[PDB]
Chain A
Amino acid sequence: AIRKKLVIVGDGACGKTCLLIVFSKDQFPEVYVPTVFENYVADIEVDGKQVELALWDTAGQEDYDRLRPLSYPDTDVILMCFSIDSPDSLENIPEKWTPEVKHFCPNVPIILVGNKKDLRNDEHTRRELAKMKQEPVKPEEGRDMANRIGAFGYMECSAKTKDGVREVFEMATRAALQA
């Protein structure tokens, strides 16, 4: 088993903390959803290769420009997250997060991940967003942003239902193994 490092970036409302928790427990917490995530080393076998994948969150570091880059050294794969219920989180991807990750993690693959995909067809979400002349992020808008920023790929998932969560981390492992 080789050791690889994964870091998740994105706005506070993107659901990055919840994604790491649901993956590490293989369960959406039934009694208490933790506020924070410390770290975790996942045992993953992707396409016959065994990897120890260390997971790191950047939540709480968003307003601290000198503390936040300290999470980046020797990262092997970046998960760049946005929330499908928040077009404002997707707009922050190309000219805030992308140039920062390209500067501190040169040549590291980036997977653009659309979180909370279960809210795309949620009536309360559609009613609330319509008040600001908005709607849930469409799948093609996600793919176009991923193409534009030079991402390795585009994926979607729901931490609430677990759908697509395992796939994201297996693909991130494959990306971390590439030359």
Chain B
Amino acid sequence: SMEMDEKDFAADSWSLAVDSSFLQQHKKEVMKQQDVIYELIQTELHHVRTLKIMTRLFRTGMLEELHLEPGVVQGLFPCVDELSDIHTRFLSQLLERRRQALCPGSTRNFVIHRLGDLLISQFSGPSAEQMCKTYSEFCSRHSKALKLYKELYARDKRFQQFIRKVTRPAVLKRHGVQECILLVTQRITKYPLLISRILQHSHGIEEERQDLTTALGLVKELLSNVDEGIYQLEKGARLQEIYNR
């Protein structure tokens, strides 16, 4: 992540991020709504960061330092550039909505009142079709990626040295190769939990309650479509095992 965004999202909550004199100006219900919106953006910032570790630290480091067989790096990190594109664009929209809401003279005091429309746009039309296509491919290649990583770590000396070198710093504690793959697979199913809790504290404006209700339905439709399009690929599986599924 970039320092500007890390500092803006360093506090455990929105109520601790904004100045205490600004906090005192809002109703309890608004503080509750804002704390959950802050959690959605803060976890989106961390998810984009997980994708950057996978693309820049792992994938590009293996291409530039190791001599793996062709198609090995793609097998380890399937769809990482497409995933990074989807989520960096979504994070950009979330951060621009926060930026526009900043009070003049402040880089931390803001209130987001219109999240619903942004969530409807992300989870409808072409962006939803690309999220569905990318996660259906990624999640179907998840088991194959873990198995390929385990094989390389156990048989390749230079690969093992590479992994131990780039994962040694404490900031990489939770972000080993397999950990990154599961963090990404689990991201999509965190959205209904966050959205429903935001909706719980968004009854003040009827149009916002309606927009978030629509967004929740769109997220669940995307999840059901991805779940129904998954079939784990396996290295070595024969056609007979596949058509006898």
Contact surface of A with B, Cβ cutoff 8 Å: 29, 31-32, 34-36, 38-41, 54, 56-57, 59-61, 63-67, 70-71, 73-74
Contacts and interface: CB of A to CB of B under 8 A. Distances in A.
Interface of B: 12-13, 15-16, 35-36, 39, 43, 46, 139, 142-143, 146, 173-174, 178-179, 182-183, 185-186, 188-194, 197, 223-224, 226-228, 230-231
Contacts of B39: 32, 34-36
Contact of A67 (B15, B139, B183, B197): B139
A36 B185 contact: no
B12 A31 contact: yes
Given A31-B13, A36-B43, A71-B186, A41 B173 contact: yes
Nearest to B195: A35
Nearest to B140: A66
B185 A67 contact: yes
Given A61-B189, A67-B139, 4 more contacts: A31-B12, A31-B15, A35-B194, A70-B139
Contacts of A73: 143, 146, 178
A64 B191 CA distance: 14
Contacts of A31: 12-13, 15-16
Nearest to A3: B176
Contacts of A29: 12
Nearest to A7: B182
A46 to B, nearest CB: 19
A61 B230 CA distance: 14
A35 B197 contact: yes
Contacts of B15: 31-32
22 contacts: A31-B16, A32-B16, A35-B193, A36-B43, A36-B194, A38-B186, A39-B183, A41-B173, A54-B174, A60-B193, A61-B189, A64-B189, A64-B223, A66-B139, A66-B228, A66-B231, A67-B227, A67-B230, A71-B182, A73-B143, A73-B146, A73-B178
Contact of A54 (B146, B179, B226): B179
B12 A32 contact: yes
A73 B186 CA distance: 14
A64 B173 contact: no
Nearest to B192: A60
A56 B13 CA distance: 22
Nearest to A56: B182
B12 A70 contact: no
A70 B185 contact: yes
Contacts of A57: 186
Contacts of B226: 67
A106 B224 CA distance: 28
B142 A39 contact: no
Contacts of A56: 182, 186
Of listed B185, B186, B193, residue having the most chain A CB within 10 A: B186
A56 B182 CA distance: 9
A90 B43 CA distance: 31
Contact of B230 (A32, A59, A66, A74): A66
A67 B12 CA distance: 29
A106 B144 CA distance: 20
B43 A38 contact: yes
A1 B189 CA distance: 32
By Cβ-Cβ distance, the 5 closest A-B pairs, closest first, are: A60-B189, A32-B13, A66-B230, A64-B227, A36-B190
